[PDB]
Every structure is written in C-alpha cells, then in structure tokens.
Amino acid sequence: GRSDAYTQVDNFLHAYARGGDELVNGHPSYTVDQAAEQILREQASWQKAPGDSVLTLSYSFLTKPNDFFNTPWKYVSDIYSLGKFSAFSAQQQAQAKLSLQSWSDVTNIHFVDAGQGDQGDLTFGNFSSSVGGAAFAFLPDVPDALKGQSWYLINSSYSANVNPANGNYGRQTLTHEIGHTLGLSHPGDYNAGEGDPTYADATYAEDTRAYSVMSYWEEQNTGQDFKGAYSSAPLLDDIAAIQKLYGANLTTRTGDTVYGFNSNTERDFYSATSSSSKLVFSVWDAGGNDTLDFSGFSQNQKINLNEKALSDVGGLKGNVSIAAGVTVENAIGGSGSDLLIGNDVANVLKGGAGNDILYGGLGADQLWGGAGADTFVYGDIAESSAAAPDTLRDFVSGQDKIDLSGLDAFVNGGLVLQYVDAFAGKAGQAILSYDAASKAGSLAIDFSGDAHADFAINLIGQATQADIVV
Template sequence: MANVVFTEKASGGDAHMTFGNYSGGQDGAAAFAYLPGTGAGYDGTSWYLINSSYTQNKNPDLNNYGRQTLTHEIGHTLGLAHPGDYNAGEGNPSYKDASYGQDTRGYSVMSYWSESNTSQNFSKGGVEAYSSGPLMDDIAAIQKLYGANYSTRAGDTTYGFNSNTGRDFYSASSSSDKLVFSVWDGGGNDTLDFSGFTQNQKINLNEASFSDVGGMVGNVSIAQGVTVENAIGGSGNDLLIGNNAANVLKGGAGNDIIYGAGGADQLWGGSGSDTFVFAASTDSKPGAADQIMDFVSGLDKIDLTGITKGAGLHFVNAFTGAAGDAILTTSGGVSTLSVDFSGHGVADFLVSTVGQAAVSDIVA
C-alpha cells in the first residue's frame, strides 16, 4: 500500500528492522519499538514480551491481540506514532487523552482505544477480533510518509469469500469468520464478497466508508482513494450501497435494499422481496442506465421517493412536458421505466428490468 519493500536479511542496510523478545522488566509492557531517528542501535528495533504468563505475542495469529501488537510495533519502526500524545510508559492514559474522536482501533492499529468509542463492534461469538493489518488512518499516514503504491492488487481482486488476495485477514471461508480490515487496492475490477454470511449486513462501496459485515459493526472499510466496483451480499436482509463507478451489486437471499448510486449499474436482488432505491435522477439516466437483472413483479420494488419526495408520478403514454411524467413499457420480458423529472418533455431518468415490472411495483 506504500512504496516500501521488505527483504529479509541478517544485517545491514539503511533501514534495517530488528525484532527481539524479552521475558520480563520494561514495566510490564507487552511490546515496544523505536521510531526512525531514535539513534544508532535503537531505531528500527521492536521488542515483544514472551513468557509463561503472557503468551499473546508467542502466537500472533489472525485476529488475536498478538498479531495486532506486531502490526502496531512495525508501524512505529516505519515512523508511525500513536494518533495522540500518549504512551503506555507515561502515566495511565485513557480515551480522554485522544486528540480527535476517531482515535480508536476502528480507524487505526496505532490507537490504544477500543473501537466501541466510535460506535463499532469487532466482537463475534463473545470473542473480540483485532485487526491484523493497517486500517484506514494507518494507510493514509504511511502513504503520506512513503507515497501510495498503486501496483498493490492492481488486477481484479476479491476480498472476503473467494478471496484471491493471498492475505489471511482479507479472506473468509466460513460464516463464523471474523473480518476486520481496510481495503487498499491499486486498480482493476474489484469485489467485496460477503456471500457466506447469514447475518444482516451493510456493504458500502464508497471510499472512506465503513461496512457492517458478518455480524460485526464497522469492521470493514475502504481507504481514501480506492475504487471497489462490486459487492455480493449474504443470506440476510442486506443493504448494498454503490458508488459512482459502474457497479455490480448482488443482494443474495433475503429481503435486500440495493442502492446503486451513480454509474451504469447491474443490480441483482436475489431471492426474497428486494427494493431498488434511487435517490437522484442522475443515479440512472439515459446513456448510463441501471439494469435490474432479476426483477420479480409483486415481490420487488423500485423506490423513487428519494427523488419525488412523495409527490408521485403521472403515468402517461407520451411525455407532456409536465414534471413527473413517467412511461413504463415492456418488450420481450424487459421493462423500461422512463421519467421526466425536470419537465422538459424528455426522459432524464431511465431504468430497465429483466422481468416484467408493473406500475404497482414502483414506489414514488
């Protein structure tokens, strides 16, 4: 995610990082590290407590505290400080010492404070999950120091189920898995695949946004400057939120709400009663219209109330120049809804459905 390359060597180099362990002392600290520029023999070194009574660092496995500790201390050796002016070796700091509200482990592995302070929840099955990789604010900070690396996952990448990232913290294989990560992606056509989860989820594809995935809250985020094109929901009642790219959004089973936003999107509700939401006429316009790929009349709905504000539509055979005129046509099993919201006598909103739609399916 940054222009840093790690190469294992015995010694030497201008930016050598050394890892060590200790069994006691250091005022009971679980780990500590030295920032660059501390001094010869110190900078680039990090130390980890390992003894019979403290074993977290001995096995820094996925989602455990030892893995987060390792990531945190590596952050220090690369030049990242805590988000605020506090340190475990200086007094008894608390969240009151935070310099800004987002100084939590929901935004940064460099923080001391629980994600609950920012209304997030990384607990599942009574077990707290910790991030094993850099989070949203860490990515921004390390890129400010070293520059953003756009060759990282520059191809078509899938995160979650069916992951091809080669990273355990970006991957899921079971509904019981706990995902805590922030996406940095250099390009390609990318997908958040949370199809294996049964809980109700919120999946948001916008940069600098958070998603509620697999029964947790605010546990998946997308870093600033990243475009993820596609999302796949699970078997719960999911909310899928697109961005201004041409998204492919698949709700899966359950009664889903799908909002494509800008771009020419392909939308699948899946089984269940699904609602396709449009908040602005520009969300689906002639020349860049959305397609609802599996519409079932009587079960699914097209919700335009975000545009009409409850004023309704006037279904006509031809536009009259009145704002709110709508034409619904069907040919070969495909319905097309055209609406003149501006009152110029031509459609400024258009959406098509694979599967015949009826006037009663449109909420305005």
C-alpha cells in the same frame, strides 16, 4: 414522503461520521487527513536514497543479545534490565513477515529478508522482564544503535506474543511495533508506563482500534464492534499516514480482486474461510475490477462501497473499510437482509437471499436483488439518467419494489406521476413498458415536461404500477 428503505440508506450513508466542530466522546472529531497528520507529529522517517522512489529496508531476527539489550540504561533512562533474551520462534518469524508485507502492500517500501542475525535495518527479538508493556520499538529519529529495533515480551505471565495469528492481539502487536519503527506514533500523547492513560487522554475521538492499529483504545468507543478480533493489518488512518510519509503503492493488487469469500488476495486478513470468520480490514487496491464478496454470511449486513466508508459485515460493526483513493466496483451480500450502497461508478450489486435494499448511486449500475423481496432505491434523477440507466437484472413483480420516494420532485416538488403510452410535453409523465417476448421492460420518466425522458431504468422482468413506490 421518504420511505423507510430510503431512510435506512440515508442513515447508513451518514454512519460513523467524522470531522466538524462538535465534541464526540468529550473529544474533537478529526477527518482521516487530520488524524494522519496527528499520527505523523514526531516528523521521524527513514530517508530514501537520492532519486529513489522506493525505500528498501532489510530485516533480520536476532540470535543473541545486542548492546542495547545488555546495557539498556546506557540508552534509555527508564530500563535497567530486560531479563533473558530469546530469538523469535518460527511462528513469530512467519507472522512478522506477514505484518511487514501488510505495510509494504500499501506504501513504497520493499522489505528484504536478511535472515538470522543483527544485520537487518529492522531487527526483532524477545525479552522476559516486563518493562510496563507487551512490546516496544524505537522511531527512526534515534541513534543508529537503537534504530529499527522492536522487542517483544515473553514470560510465564504474558503469552500473547508466543502465538501471533490472523485476528489476534499478538499479530496486531507485530503490525503496531513495525509501524513505530517506520515513523508512526500513537494517535495521542500517551504511552504504556507513562502515567495511567485511558481513552479520555486521546487527542481526537477517532483514536480507536477501529481506525488505527497504533491506537490503544477499544473500537466500541467509536461505535464499532469486532467481537474480540483485532485488525492484523493497517487500518484507514494508518494507511493515510504511512502513504503521506512514503507514498502510495500503486502496483498492489492491480488485477481484478476479490475480498472476503473466494478471495484471490493471498492475504489472510482479507480472506473469509467460513460463515464464522470475523473479518476486520481496510481495502488498499491500486486498480482493476474489484469485488467485496460477503456471500457466505447469514447475518444482516450493511455494505458501503464509497471510499473512506465503513461497513457492518458478517455480524460485526464497522469492521470493513475502503481506503482513501480506492475504487471498489462490486459487492455481493449474504443470505440475510442486506443494505448495499454503491458509489459513483458503474457497480454490480447482488443482494442474494433475504429482503435486501440496493442503492446504485451514480453510474449505470447492474442490480440483482436475488431471492426475497428487494427494494431498489433512488435519491436523485442523475443516478439513473436516460443516457446511462441502471438495469435491474432479476426484477420480480409483486415481490421487488422500485423506490423513488426520496426524489426531490416527490418529497418537495409535490409532483404526481402520470402513466401514459407517449410523452406529450407534461412534467411527471411516465411510460412503463414490457416486451413479454424478450422479457425486457423499462420505466422512463419525463420530469421536465419537454417530452424527453430524464430518468430511466432498464428491467429484466416486468414491473407494474403497484411495484413503484412514490
């Protein structure tokens, strides 16, 4: 019967499920693609020059009020006065550039710094009189007099826009407003100032800040928990939406990249600096051998390398995700008892200290349990075929375990393992080998009964019959 380790893997593989025809929080559930279409419903975008595959947009920071600011009512019916104008401070300008960079990283847009003034396609400025929201922007389908503008509230009562920084609301606000200027709408038909919207007004269940920075709703609505942090950069559904609009950026981070601790991304939101770092990010990466390094955390973590999957990292829930179309190869756990789930390619998974559960999935994986009693789980023969077996790099008999309980043959076929020294043409025969000189071992199983191994696992260290579950 399926062990608890196998059950934990299965449960996490199906965590944060999306799609289908059942109600979730009183709303229909949408897949990433369905949500992306919803976010793009306005059908507004900047036009690329004929033939150009890359859209180039400039930006500038206003130094004085413009026509809209002076006479709002001539452009929008609801706004009569914006109060007093103020230019973006150095802090705001620096943070704005990081937000713009986070959008250009994922799609084919090149942002050009046009400096101080009103010459940029995109412009930024502050206002002091509350218009029912922290900031506002215009979608690209408005008159040239309003196109590309985003405005931010700064007054004695509201200070979130004064100090934007990685992980805070001010930084997410910049990313959110820039998203509007590029053509993205909120995931549902709601807006600050129009009635009194709540999550009950969302069109689909996944309209939360766990999936889109364009959402107004807390991540807890969908089961995630960022402990007060806010995503600084585009999330899973934002990436899907913007790429459908301007294309996927296939040159971003094409080298071997490390996310988390020891990051070489040069992106504040992808970097962990201490065991206290609250990470919230969705990985966009165009190539190379990449690694999710979460070695510096001591909390129990659940890491899933499959595209579109969410992971529970550094004490938060559903805070790390991998964008659709991205292949991340390796993952390193921390000192807690972690769950590491690989994907279809060859992965290097390292559990570190703690009693970890590792699941390589398809491909010939290199698995390191590290210190502690680790369990290497298998759910299908194909996951470690005789032709491309996994290698358990630091197996310690009596401590670690090889778990085969979830295989169909044992759960359903009622097969019983019979250890022998040579195959004789009988299903279920297994050969456990160990060369004490090289310290290399092996487990080979003939499930078909043709005297040819169908499943095999290479070992560095000895494994005994007592180390193999079911």
